[PDB]
Amino acid sequence: LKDAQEKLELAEKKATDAEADVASLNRRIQLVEEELDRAQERLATALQKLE
Amino acid sequence: LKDAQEKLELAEKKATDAEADVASLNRRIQLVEEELDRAQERLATALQKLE
Numbered sequence: 001l002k003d004a005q006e007k008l009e010l011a012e013k014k015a016t017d018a019e020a021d022v023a024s025l026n027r028r029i030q031l032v033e034e035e036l037d038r039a040q041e042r043l044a045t046a047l048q049k050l051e
Numbered sequence: 052l053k054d055a056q057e058k059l060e061l062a063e064k065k066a067t068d069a070e071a072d073v074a075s076l077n078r079r080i081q082l083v084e085e086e087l088d089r090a091q092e093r094l095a096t097a098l099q100k101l102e
Contacts, residue, residue: 029076
């Protein structure tokens with residue numbers, strides 16, 4: 001049980017770290033997605049101006 | 052020991068799944084950043100042609 005508890009602590013710390021990484025990376029994903037959406041809207045407007 | 056090992060198993064599974072999610076989100080970040088860069092380049096070229 002002692003070794004199992006120590007491994008539990010290590011695993012939960014690592015999982016929490018990876019969950020924070022998930023939160024940060026998903027925030028980056030959404031922000032870059034919004035920037036890409038703005039870029040493609042600008043591209044559509046540019047093609048309209050070309051026409 | 053049964054409870055301790057069950058907790059170990061659940062924590063390890065959660066940490067492994069979180070690591071996989073982190074890797075997937077990071078590769079998603081790089082993919083979306085590449086797409087964003089291409090969109091920005093297209094925007095610049097289109098604006099120049101428009102002018």
